[PDB]
Chain A
């Protein structure tokens, strides 16, 4: 039965999911902490390089 639910519009119709036949179209964020650490290390390195300029 369907019952009383919201009318769904989830918009997942396009080949977004990678599988045996599809490359997929996805973006995960698993590298988020490593990229945060890299950005901070890079800022520290650039501050070291351009000392004493702000």
Chain B
């Protein structure tokens, strides 16, 4: 009934996802692979969407909006890869099934997520050693049940 064209006309200047800070217009939409505020990258808006996300461990997850259940927000997004050590091109082809116009950015995002996971491993190990050197007068333990 109401197209992505009309919805983009409606939300472009004003939206809870538009972050206009300084003179820069970014997006904190969860389904935006870029953070750029463009109709192409508005995953929350588009009928079909796909976003590359990180998962537990070195895994890479792809979330897909196939447009078949857009009236059902709980069923709107589906997790489809959640695999570890996938080629970035494999993520790119998983994304291109719904949105070929998102292939390049999702490939780059897959590579960036892999880089981030390895970097986080290194930083965490260094921080752990530094911590093992220190007395640490207080330590909080979450209650377990």
User: Do A and B contact each other directly (Cβ–Cβ < 8 Å)?
Assistant: no
